[PDB]
């Protein structure tokens, strides 16, 4: 039924309100192949990294508006340790390899009660720059238009143009095209999404890629009568499925 335990290595995570794992674009997104752009023998999965990594995420309050989101890059949250997400031997393997190729498997836990309302949109969003320059990022007109995405400054030679659009916008009404599940306060306390590797190349650089971004967006604001539990904490669990590390070198220095 709704009680599933997902063992991965020495890690087993439980939920008793499971909505079923949302597999993205294929039946088994764990099935993956070695990259065709690297002639060396890749480093496949091993039991110290074939596990779940649990980080915290910022609390969800009544003051958090509609479409106010919160983004977790993959594997970008392993590098910067976003939300206390120490990647262990996965990040230790990732800093020593130039290319990395994996799909992901996420679970975002957020336990509400039967007296709470509200909804979260937990989605895996491909190729966004939402970690680049509060507890929650607000959906302004700059995020809806891509107007605030990073750019090369044209210099003093050019007249600086009125920037009006960028392709890494967020249309906040179309975030359910992504591999998503809604974390309703009256159906479930956690959601499961399994995504495969995607990218412009068969394998991408370990330090730079943002092929998947975990996106937790508020669709309905949190509401409760006073006396209930205020500000429930959002946490997430990330499991890399089938990594193909390539290009072994020394640990990454800037």
């Amino acid at each position: 039924d709704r009680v599933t335990t997902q063992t991965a290595g020495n890690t087993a995570i439980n939920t008793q309100s499971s909505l079923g794992v949302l597999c993205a674009y294929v039946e088994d997104p764990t099935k993956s192949d070695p990259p065709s752009s690297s002639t060396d023998q890749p480093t496949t999965t091993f039991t110290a990294i074939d596990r779940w990594y649990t980080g915290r995420l910022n609390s969800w309050t009544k003051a958090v508006k509609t479409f106010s989101f919160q983004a977790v890059p993959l594997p970008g949250a392993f590098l910067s340790r976003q939300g206390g997400l120490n990647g262990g031997a996965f990040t230790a393997t990732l800093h020593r390899h130039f290319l990395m190729k994996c799909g992901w498997q996420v679970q975002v836990q957020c336990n509400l009660t039967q007296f709470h309302q509200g909804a979260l949109l937990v989605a895996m969003v491909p190729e966004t720059t939402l970690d680049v320059k509060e507890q929650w990022v607000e959906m302004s007109d700059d995020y809806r238009t891509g107007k605030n995405m990073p750019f090369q400054s044209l210099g003093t030679y050019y007249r600086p143009p009125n920037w009006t659009w960028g392709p890494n916008f967020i249309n906040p009404y179309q975030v359910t095209v992504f591999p998503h599940q809604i974390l309703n306060a009256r159906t479930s306390t956690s959601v499961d999404i399994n995504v495969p590797y995607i990218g412009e190349t068969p394998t991408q650089s370990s330090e730079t890629q943002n092929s998947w971004t975990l996106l937790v967006m508020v669709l309905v604001p949190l509401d409760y009568k006073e006396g209930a539990t205020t500000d429930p904490e959002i946490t997430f669990s990330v499991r890399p499925t089938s990594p193909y590390f390539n290009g072994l070198r020394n640990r990454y220095t800037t």
Binding site: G20, V21, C23, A24, Y25, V26, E27, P179
Partner: protein
């Protein structure tokens, strides 16, 4: 086949006209599966 009404005759080869991948040696499916 795209926006191509030609059914008769291709003058150039498939490698000249198109660009085919190299090797490493109706029914519209869903883009997400509940498992």
């Amino acid at each position: 086949r795209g926006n191509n009404g030609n059914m008769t005759f291709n003058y150039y080869a498939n490698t000249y006209q198109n660009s085919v991948d190299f090797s490493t040696s109706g029914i519209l499916n869903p883009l997400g599966y509940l498992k």
